[PDB]
Design a protein around this ligand. Sequence first.
Ligand SMILES: CCCCCCCCCCCC[N+](C)(C)[O-]
Ligand SMILES: CCCCCCCCCCCC[N+](C)(C)[O-]
Ligand SMILES: CCCCCCCCCCCC[N+](C)(C)[O-]
Ligand SMILES: CCCCCCCCCCCC[N+](C)(C)[O-]
Ligand SMILES: CCCCCCCCCCCC[N+](C)(C)[O-]
Ligand SMILES: CCCCCCCCCCCC[N+](C)(C)[O-]
Ligand SMILES: CCCCCCCCCCCC[N+](C)(C)[O-]
Ligand SMILES: CCCCCCCCCCCC[N+](C)(C)[O-]
Ligand SMILES: CCCCCCCCCCCC[N+](C)(C)[O-]
Ligand SMILES: CCCCCCCCCCCC[N+](C)(C)[O-]
Lengths: 21, 693
Amino acid sequence: GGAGHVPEYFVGIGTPISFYG
Amino acid sequence: SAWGPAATIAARQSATGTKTDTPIQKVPQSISVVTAEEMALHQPKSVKEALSYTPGVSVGTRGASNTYDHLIIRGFAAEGQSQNNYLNGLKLQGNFYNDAVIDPYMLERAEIMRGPVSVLYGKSSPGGLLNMVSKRPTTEPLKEVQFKAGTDSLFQTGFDFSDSLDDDGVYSYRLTGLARSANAQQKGSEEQRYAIAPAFTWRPDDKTNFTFLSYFQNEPETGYYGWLPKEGTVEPLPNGKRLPTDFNEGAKNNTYSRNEKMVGYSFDHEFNDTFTVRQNLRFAENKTSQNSVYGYGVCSDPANAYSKQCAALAPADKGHYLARKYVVDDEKLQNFSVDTQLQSKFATGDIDHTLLTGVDFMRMRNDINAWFGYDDSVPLLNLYNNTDFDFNAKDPANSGPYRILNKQKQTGVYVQDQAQWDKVLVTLGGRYDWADQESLNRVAGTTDKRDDKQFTWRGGVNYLFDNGVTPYFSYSESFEPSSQVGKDGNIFAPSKGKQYEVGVKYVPEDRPIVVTGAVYNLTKTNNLMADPEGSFFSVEGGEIRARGVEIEAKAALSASVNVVGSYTYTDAEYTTDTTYKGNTPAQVPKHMASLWADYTFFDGPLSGLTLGTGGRYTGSSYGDPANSFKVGSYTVVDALVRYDLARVGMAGSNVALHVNNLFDREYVASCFNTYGCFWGAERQVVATATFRF
Ligand SMILES: CCCCCCCCCCCC[N+](C)(C)[O-]
Ligand SMILES: CCCCCCCCCCCC[N+](C)(C)[O-]
Ligand SMILES: CCCCCCCCCCCC[N+](C)(C)[O-]
Ligand SMILES: CCCCCCCCCCCC[N+](C)(C)[O-]
Ligand SMILES: CCCCCCCCCCCC[N+](C)(C)[O-]
Ligand SMILES: CCCCCCCCCCCC[N+](C)(C)[O-]
Ligand SMILES: CCCCCCCCCCCC[N+](C)(C)[O-]
Ligand SMILES: CCCCCCCCCCCC[N+](C)(C)[O-]
Ligand SMILES: CCCCCCCCCCCC[N+](C)(C)[O-]
Ligand SMILES: CCCCCCCCCCCC[N+](C)(C)[O-]
């Protein structure tokens, strides 16, 4: 849901890309 | 013992907190200085270990990994967990995985600024800033060649050469280089570095200095950067057993490279007693690429709730099976900075003034060409048990692209006055920044833009007692733009830092002692938090507060005994957050401390022998923002034996043996979440031979 390096646990093919890295 | 007066007298001078050359007791904020002599004694693997004995930093958060120089200063890290690192007063501006590192062998010093410093540097973390200083051409000639060999197949060859070209020394050069090879702690993971630093100084007179500074580095492999669960590290598996400290959850064919190229200069000219001009400029190009399979916790972890592979297993096997994901990445970034300053010294009756007026401009461009593996994109790893992975066969069912072009630019105009009235020194300044960002998602064809206009100021007072005791107070501010887009499709407003600090600096002119104390209240406002109405989008308005006590002490006890040490109390909390109000942020211990001492023999048959030992203590921290579990405390001990070869007719030459984590303690450095834990560094033993000609 934020800035980072690794996509969040909910991020998929039909999902907006947010990070937690 | 060069490190002795270096740590106590040479380290009294600084420029990072004021942009003017100001003694540390005259700086109205917390600042620490690590000299090249202290770095030659301790031989730190990176700039982070060089700061181990300074307060208010977490230099070991990532454990064994040495990919980046990430620091948690006063409970805070930079927006998007990027580094907030400077080189020669200019930002090493990074984005995503494309962040640059400078080898400590190439540095003259490192200065760390704690708290908000936007007043001089623009957008910056509320926690602080690190500024490194490149090795400069020397007066006297230098002809150093160094060799290292240690644990985990460590091998290093370095050289450091400097001299005048002419007889008057108006043209001088420096050339520092190194080649390093080692295995990472983790099985199948290797590290490689080849770095060279050409430098050239033109000093036509005692009032002018133009120095060309360049840095080139190539790292075919940077090593481990994986994630591991609290199940098998902090806590035991259902089995009752734990994963080894060399455990690697990646693929046999995980690769990770970095390439860095920089050119620029440092210019200063003194016109007269009133006016001095300064200009710092750098052009840099950074590249990174990786193929990395990495861990995403055990199947009983809520992060793996949508994983099919995990759902398939029996509730008796979920707790010891590890869900994994992957990232394929290719980045190229270009960065440019110019800081231009005018320094004006004058008096107004009983008040002496040092007025600084400057213009600062930076631009960064980062082109990301990536591919991410989502749920069920890589097979599970039985933790009760290494093969290749196909990175090139990118499956539309569980993997997708990530192609972005990120642009940033910032212009700042700032004014500062250091006004001295008798023993009262007043520091007052302000900065105005125009920070503009622009992100092109090449897949979606959309551009997100935001232009921020922000004002920050700092006001301080230092009362200089004649005995060296200097109480001080300051208010200081910072801002950080957001890179994140809300429900409504717009980039969020910036986060801000607001700090109050009171302290006392003990810097006596007649004794080799530096002792500082500081108590502070640092607040981060407009922090991003969870949507209260529930969505995949964050909301702004959150708040994090850090209050703490910091003590640093550095003294030459006797002619042969040297001490360095620190203590930190950090009370960090979410004061406003949808999910975590009242909790403590992860990886932030309440208590940290360190103490080092060295003895040098100068008279008997053990003449020129240095013996040194130090201990670094990290209290307990929380392993997640939910504060569902804790990471246990640990104390690590380092030791060294150094022998000057002057008695064997080789003055300047020495041989040493360093031992890091002497008692080979097994510990979890930290966890940022239940699925993201890092094993601490295992005992390291290194032999170094450095010869002067
Ligand atoms: C990046 C800006 C560089 C400007 C270079 C001009 C510096 C002038 C140095 C001359 C100093 C006086 N002297 C007597 C040696 O000619
Ligand atoms: C014993 C002295 C020899 C030390 C080894 C010096 C290696 C030089 C490093 C070259 C790296 C060049 N580059 C541009 C690819 O980074
Ligand atoms: C000593 C001053 C050197 C300044 C030279 C200016 C750099 C040239 C920039 C053009 C490079 C552009 N491109 C795309 C053709 O590589
Ligand atoms: C950005 C504005 C900066 C300009 C500040 C001007 C203050 C200069 C005061 C001159 C001091 C006068 N004097 C002759 C007694 O030294
Ligand atoms: C070092 C001296 C620099 C002068 C500072 C002038 C900057 C002020 C510009 C603010 C623009 C006004 N605003 C808030 C409507 O955008
Ligand atoms: C060199 C002197 C310039 C910096 C002066 C410091 C600015 C302090 C102004 C406080 C602004 C507070 N507020 C809420 C009214 O914006
Ligand atoms: C001598 C001082 C020089 C002042 C420099 C002026 C900086 C203002 C630039 C703002 C950038 C403009 N914008 C709209 C793209 O954000
Ligand atoms: C003239 C320098 C002396 C130090 C002054 C420090 C006073 C702190 C200012 C209070 C800050 C309040 N506020 C709301 C503007 O953030
Ligand atoms: C824990 C706070 C850190 C600051 C330590 C204060 C040191 C004060 C020493 C005073 C010594 C007085 N003497 C002997 C120079 O006259
Ligand atoms: C010598 C003066 C000492 C001043 C200390 C006062 C600290 C006040 C802290 C304000 C806290 C307010 N807030 C909302 C930013 O957390």
